């Protein structure tokens, strides 16, 4: 059924054994082997889009390794010329299905690092991610990022984060910032996001562990105005008795309920659960 709240899951589908996330060792980074992996990941991207259209999922997060090692100085070919046509085609499918596409670079992507080498590698990775979403024609695509490390002093870490991203026209087309469970709350992310002119993704588990002064309801209410399009939110549940913020297999009914009650209006909810497409109902 057609709900005002659209759902998604990241990277892979467990029912199908489909993934967008195959990689390889850099010792095996041959033109032929990468083309191998990329092809299977693109095949799987397509199956997933089709499975989502038949099973009520409007959102999908494409894993970083879709084109394995694309941002790496040893990448064996022009991936954009190789794939532009097929990405446009997959992009048109996703739009025909009404699907919204996203990527979330890992915890080692840190534009606010003071190490210039980490900055350059991080920027390379975000530029590849943004180019991919551009080639898929993802008009409302999202590229989600945590604010990363305090590196001893937050004011300076944030100023580096903004300086190192303000110039990046293409990345800024898609970039949205997300609160975390340890270092940067929603009030903090809203400040960073305004400086950069980008939206805020509220994560409900992270919010719970690290709320600042804000009830979830006010967090969502402040975040909603930061999206020109449909706001995106993350939904996870605590994996019982494990490390705080560890993701449960399936989201609880109680946690789903609490978000539904807090949302100020229509939004897109990425379910971050170890079960993937089995993470809710
Ligand atoms: Mn996140
Ligand atoms: Mn999250
Ligand atoms: Mn999390
Ligand atoms: Na409730």
Automatic annotation (TrEMBL):
Gene Ontology molecular functions: endonuclease activity; hydrolase activity; metal ion binding
Residues that coordinate or bind Mn(2+) 2: 178, 203, 234, 272
Example of a GO biological process term: response to UV
PTM sites of type N6-carboxylysine: 232
Stored NCBIfam families: uvde
Keywords, in A-Z order: DNA damage, DNA excision, DNA repair, Endonuclease, Hydrolase, Metal-binding, Nuclease, Plasmid
Sequence positions that bind Mn(2+) 1: 104, 146, 178
Protein residues bound to Mn(2+) 3: 203, 206, 247
Record organism: Thermus thermophilus (strain ATCC BAA-163 / DSM 7039 / HB27)
Protein name: Probable UV endonuclease
UniProt modified residues of type N6-acetyllysine: 232
InterPro entries: UvdE, Xyl_isomerase-like_sf
Binding site for Mn(2+) 4: 206, 247
